[PDB]
Amino acid sequence: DPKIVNIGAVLSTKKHEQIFREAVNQANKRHFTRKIQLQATSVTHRPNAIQMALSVCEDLISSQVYAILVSHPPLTPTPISYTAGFYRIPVIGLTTRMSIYSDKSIHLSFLRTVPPYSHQALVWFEMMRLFNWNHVILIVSDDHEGRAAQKKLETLLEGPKADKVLQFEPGTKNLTALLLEAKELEARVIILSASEDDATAVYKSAAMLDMTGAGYVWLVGEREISGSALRYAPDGIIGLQLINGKNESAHISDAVAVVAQAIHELFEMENITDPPRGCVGNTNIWKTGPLFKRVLMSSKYPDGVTGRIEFNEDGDRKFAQYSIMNLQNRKLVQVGIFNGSYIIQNDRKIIWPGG
Amino acid sequence: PPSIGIAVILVGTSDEVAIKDAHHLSVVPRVELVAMNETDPKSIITRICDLMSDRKIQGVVFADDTDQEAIAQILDFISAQTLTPILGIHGGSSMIMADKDESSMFFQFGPSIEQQASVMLNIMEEYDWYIFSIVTTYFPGYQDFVNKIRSTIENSFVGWELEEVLLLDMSLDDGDSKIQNQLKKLQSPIILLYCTKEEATYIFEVANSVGLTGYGYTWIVPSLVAGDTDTVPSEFPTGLISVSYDEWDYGLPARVRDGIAIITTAASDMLSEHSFIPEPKSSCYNTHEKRIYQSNMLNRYLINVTFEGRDLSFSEDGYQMHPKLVIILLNKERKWERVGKWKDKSLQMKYYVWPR
């Protein structure tokens, strides 16, 4: 008999539980599992954060999980990160994109197989080189996500330069003062980070100031061409969609592969201890937790369903693939992809604002 | 006058009798001592939720005898989720949490991060120690610590010289000897350390391996590193200096008294202006639906309470406003020893010159 090593998951549906089950069973098939052999333990999301925390203890940590997969319900991963982090049990985010999960102080054992929204700056930057936009205006919401995008782009720039950064208070509906400050500047290329509703307010104000026509380039991310943002978005706008970013099934499969590889790598080392069994009466960290986190952080899985899987220094997905989308006659049209490191233009012509 | 329920939760050895002894308004407290054995997330959540579904709990006063700073994090989580006032008055429950939730009604006895950092520079100026480095982990607050120092320095006509700031990642194992390589970069004779007690235990063990604990190096840490001063890890270097609120002149009986008063006064003050107080949540299981019916309105009163002509007010950030702090020094017998008070924004030290 082998040593049985539990992996946990908090997932959206029973269907996705079964997928996780089958992924773990496949990992057992394809790995050499005389010594150690994985076992799937899963629940679905609870209705509120306190019940979810309790469930992590009662359902998962009671089974001594070495790691916990967590999907964003479509109520956040946060309670699961908190509770699991208490013990230094690693959490793998499957679909959560918010930049806040990259903060070690808050989420101190958290990796994810999708990138945070802020990493869209990586694509903007390659776009700016490609189309030789050397002077841009950056408009970001004055919240965490907005400031995260700013920091990320400013790091890449510091070739092309930002002529100015403008931040606005989230939830503001008349943005003409801010947008007037951008109109006076010379650069005509405008990059936007904002939630759905805040992008809407921007697009409206920009249209009333006639900043959405010929001359101007608008470069945004995924949130800014989603839901209601899309409904008032100007033609010619360029935006992004994370390929497979919403495919819980794809990420379950990839996350399990990575975690299974990492478990087997872990157990080549000496003096591996088990995680605590249950929460009750246990207040010490899992001593091997920090080691297992390092092994995950450095895991490389080239043959992923979502592409090439590595993690950066914050445990965020690297080599993510984006669709480059262009609003033409009010339809979203793919004009290229960012394949992880390289921009590939397809045969469909970009139509800019105006044209 | 109507009665509000207040749970007083005590973890670990405590004299309940002496407590129930230290203990005019529009409302009147019904106090309820609960003892608790464990301080894991489940035990703490389950205990408080069970309390809230048996009795009608307006507020929670929490004290423990551990060094577990995580207790404060758990309580803030519970407070924000259920919108219930919780005071962490002693132990891990009072170990500063930076960045409490927007909806938190969690308040802690003891100094903010920024105030401790201010005290630490005052100690340095007294003995003309102007050259120093900073070591922190990623423990929440560490940025607020570094920033407070930096902006005090920057705005001073004094010849401060901050030489190095180290950030230590102890979420990963140290089999590459990273922390050792970082520590071996320190030259300064004063080193300010921000981290948890358990983290400092490890950091000191490593610093010693590299010759940084002995003479020529003085380490200064905040309250939560000293923690319970009757528990002194062996790795802690003789000569360690700490700001402390561990329990010197402000005893647990008195703390529980003031805790009960703060919640009671605050509720009275609200009933008097608005002709209602918020109704005790009767469930943690239900907090998602009943949420538009709840707010943290009681906070604005929680923070402006005078009792027995003692100003007990909190900051909006949820720490005590004017704590009398005790500066302590780990002596040759490896006991913690009083060597200073920080009273009225004034530092009063015992020694003009440090003995060894």
Ligand SMILES: *[C@@H]1O[C@H](CO)[C@@H](O[C@@H]2O[C@H](CO)[C@@H](O[C@@H]3O[C@H](CO[C@H]4O[C@H](CO)[C@@H](O)[C@H](O)[C@@H]4O)[C@@H](O)[C@H](O[C@H]4O[C@H](CO)[C@@H](O)[C@H](O)[C@@H]4O)[C@@H]3O)[C@H](O)[C@H]2NC(C)=O)[C@H](O)[C@H]1NC(C)=O
């Ligand atoms: C995203 O898209 C990028 C760009 O297309 C991909 O990166 C390229 O990956 C291909 C592999 O398919 C690489 O192609 C190989 O190039 C080798 C030499 O590369 C040098 O020269 C190129 C061009 O100047 C430089 O870009 C590069 O920096 C190097 O200096 C060749 O030796 C290889 O030839 C081999 O295969 C051929 C075809 O079968 C055989 O005939 C040969 O015998 C030989 O075995 C090959 O052509 C390319 O170098 C990569 N470019 C870059 C910039 O990295 C990414 O792979 C892609 N990402 C994903 C996830 O798909």
Ligand SMILES: CCCN(CCc1ccc(Cl)c(Cl)c1)C[C@H](O)COc1ccc(NS(C)(=O)=O)cc1
């Ligand atoms: C805003 C902060 C939120 N907090 C959540 C803690 C928590 C909340 C609720 C519960 Cl229910 C539990 Cl269970 C745990 C984060 C947690 O406090 C992080 O803990 C540490 C972070 C960093 C470090 N330093 S490090 C990365 O070098 O090792 C140490 C502890």
Ligand SMILES: *[C@@H]1O[C@H](CO)[C@@H](O)[C@H](O)[C@H]1NC(C)=O
């Ligand atoms: C999601 O990924 C799976 C592979 O795991 C694939 O079979 C399926 O087609 C994908 N779904 C979509 C909508 O592309």
Ligand SMILES: *[C@@H]1O[C@H](CO)[C@@H](O)[C@H](O)[C@H]1NC(C)=O
């Ligand atoms: C806590 O420990 C005390 C002392 O032994 C005991 O009386 C009590 O039953 C314990 N409580 C629980 C919930 O186990």
Ligand SMILES: *[C@@H]1O[C@H](CO)[C@@H](O)[C@H](O)[C@H]1NC(C)=O
């Ligand atoms: C706090 O102290 C008293 C009320 O007790 C009063 O002088 C002051 O205005 C109060 N602050 C408020 C109500 O914000």
Ligand SMILES: [Cl-]
């Ligand atoms: Cl096998």
Ligand SMILES: [Cl-]
């Ligand atoms: Cl449990």
Ligand SMILES: [Cl-]
């Ligand atoms: Cl194209």
Ligand SMILES: [Cl-]
């Ligand atoms: Cl208990």
Ligand SMILES: [Cl-]
């Ligand atoms: Cl919270």
Ligand SMILES: [Cl-]
């Ligand atoms: Cl503290």
Ligand code: NA
């Ligand atoms: Na991370």
